[PDB]
Every structure is written in structure tokens, then in C-alpha cells.
Amino acid sequence: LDFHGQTVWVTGAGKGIGYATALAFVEAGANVTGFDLAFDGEGYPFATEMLDVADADQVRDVCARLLNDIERLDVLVNAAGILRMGATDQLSAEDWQQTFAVNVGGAFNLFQQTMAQFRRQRGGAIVTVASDAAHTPRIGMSAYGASKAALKSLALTVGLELAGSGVRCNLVSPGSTDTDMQRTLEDAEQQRIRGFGEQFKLGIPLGKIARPQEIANTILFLASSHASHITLQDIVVDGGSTLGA
């Protein structure tokens, strides 16, 4: 998959799946800009922009400055997200509000500031990282899953709005992936693969959890010309755990 001479923006690029994705686009030849609240690495193989995607004002300013200098935004990837766990009636009011401000509002803010660019240029691809928790209820993750189901719906309607401009808009829904967000919760991995029948959580038929590169490669496929007739789709990347749900 050859992205030479394409401008690619990736949110959540300071680490994890967002980092892996931005690096994969660099490895594919793209001119990559990463966006994140914090870049704690000593060096990044791409341009980096400090941005709190939940802050509508900050997103308008950064997008306006950058969009001045580029003719074309070839790929937007929304991968910024936070995970706040809890029984629904124990989750704090801050955890609720921040979950939705970031996981839905972030993409909303980026969409509000980039859709005109996508309409003007007449093409491009958007890939949004949802989650398997948007596909199946998960004990402890009611808010997280709800925010990711709202993100998915928003991205699909934005895809429908932009389809007349030739823009393709798709999603990837990872299952458990080896990143910082997952390590916070070391037999945990084998037990995830096995499942928790007591929590109605299916094991992983493929017998392993995901690598961030395995999510990245799916994003690149959907962003690429190989997927030139794919839009409004959501690929679950989870070793079969949701059984196709």
C-alpha cells in the first residue's frame, strides 16, 4: 500500500494505536501529521501538533492554520480516545462527561473543521477507530461503549454526507489490543483470550490479543485505493471474539 505524496492526519498519535497508525503511514510513504494532548516520546517520525481534540476552539485554530498550507487532506484518522471504567451507577460525573467530550466530541470537532476541505477537494478517506464495545454490551464499560457507538453513528452519517464528494468513511473496531490503555487493567492476557463466561464475555477464537500494528494495517487498507469501493463499513479486528457482531 503506497501513500506517497499523500497528506495524512492522525489523532491520538502520541502513543498506542494512533502512534502505530501514523508510523505505518510514514512507512507507506505519506506526509504524516500526528495530533495528541501529549507527546511523551523523545522523538517522533512525523510532524506533531499539540491539540486537545475535545476543545472546539483549539481544534478550529489548529485546523485553520494547517489547512492554510495544504491543498489536500488525503486521509483523516480519528484514534484519540479515553477509557473510563465503572458500573453504570458508580461512574463519576467527570468520567461520564470526559468520556463523551473526547470520544465523540473530538471527532465531531475535527469533522466540523475539515468537512469543507473534503467537499472542496472532491475525494479523500476518513477512518475512525471505534471499539468492539460498540458492538456488544460490556460489563464495566457502559459509558465507554456508549461513546464509541455514538462515534460510529456520527462517522457513518458524516460518511453519508460526504459520499457525494467522493470521500470514503469507514471504521475499525478493535478488540483487546496490547497498548497502554489495555495494560492498566500478568495472567490478564491469557484470561482475556480464555474469556469470562460469568461476565458474558467471549474468549478470543484466534487465541491471542491484537497488536497495534494489526489495527494500523486495517486502517491503512481502508484508507487506501484498494478499498476504493468501500464506505460506511466497520471492520472489527478482534480475533473473532464478538463472533461477527
144 is catalytic: yes
Is 144 annotated to bind a ligand? Reply is yes
Is 131 annotated to bind a ligand? Reply is yes
**Site residues, ligand NAD (CB under 6 A):** 11-12, 14-18, 36-38, 51-54, 79-83, 102, 106, 129, 131, 174, 176-177, 179-182
- For the stretch 15-19, contacts whose Cβ atoms lie closer than 8 Å and that sit 24 or more positions apart, written own/partner, are 15/40, 15/41, 15/179, 15/180, 16/79, 16/177, 16/179, 16/180, 16/181, 16/212, 17/79, 17/129, 17/174, 17/177, 17/179, 17/212, 17/215, 17/216, 18/77, 18/79, 18/80, 18/129, 19/212
Is 79 annotated to bind a ligand? Reply is yes
Is 236 annotated to bind a ligand? Reply is no
Q: Min. distance of Cβ 142 from ligand NAD in angstroms?
A: 15
CA 229 to centroid of chain Cα atoms? 21
The active-site residue out of 144, 168, 172, 212 is: 144
Q: Which is closer to ligand NAD, CB of 40 or CB of 187?
A: 40
Q: Min. distance of Cβ 25 from ligand NAD in angstroms?
A: 15
Q: Min. distance of Cβ 197 from ligand NAD in angstroms?
A: 20
Cβ neighbours of 42 (radius 10 Å): 5
Residues taking part in catalysis = 144
- Which amino acids are annotated as binding site, given as ranges? 17, 36, 52-53, 79-81, 131, 144, 148, 177, 179
